[PDB]
Amino acid sequence: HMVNPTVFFDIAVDGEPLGRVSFELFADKVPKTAENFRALSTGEKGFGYKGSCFHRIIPGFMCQGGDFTRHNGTGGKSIYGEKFEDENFILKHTGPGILSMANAGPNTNGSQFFICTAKTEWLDGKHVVFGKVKEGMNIVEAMERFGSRNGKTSKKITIADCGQL
């Protein structure tokens, strides 16, 4: 029987450790999308999230990260190539803690993702939901205090380490 994978991020604020966020990846519903995020979290293909930052944090909305090639929301790449398709839209943006793919149009998933800090139901059917925060929502809430209305962060919020549990 297959078990959904768990990954973790160790978060830092201007280099100072803050805490750990862990995620369940819904490989039972979106295996291709879950596998991309899993592999980028372990770095096992030779690239991935370690060291990257959350470039946009809007309190009461979401935290966005995963751009390890341009560091500002314009880049990133998947383990399948620069982009891959929307796998399905079975899962919805139901509340805080949902983990979903960022994109720039249909079938443009890369490595960027966001963590909801509110219900974002208007994104249902256009961003692929593929996981949820398991432990550490308190750490996501602490990250949120470094965001702003326009999303610029007041301190640099990084993934100091990440991997699979």
Catalytic positions are 56, 61, 64, 103, 114, 123, 127
Candidate list 32, 103, 124, 155; residue touching ligand UOD; CB under 6 A:
103
The closest of 97, 70, 79, 98 to 31, measured between CA atoms, is: 79
- Choose between 11 and 98: whose C-beta lies nearer to ligand UOD: 98
Q: Where are the beta strands (DSSP E) in the chain?
A: 6-13, 16-25, 54-58, 62-65, 98-101, 113-116, 129-135, 157-164
**Least distance (Å) from ligand UOD to the CB of residue 3?**
28
Measured from the CB atom, the residue of 55 and 134 that comes closer to ligand UOD is 55
Residue environment code for 93-118, b if the CB has 16+ CB neighbours within 10 A, otherwise e: beebbbbbbbbeeeeebbbbbbbbbe
Of 28 and 82, nearer to ligand UOD (C-beta) is: 82
Does 151 sit near ligand UOD (CB under 6 A)?
yes
Residues that bind ligand UOD (CB under 6 A): 56, 62, 64, 73-74, 102-104, 112, 114, 151
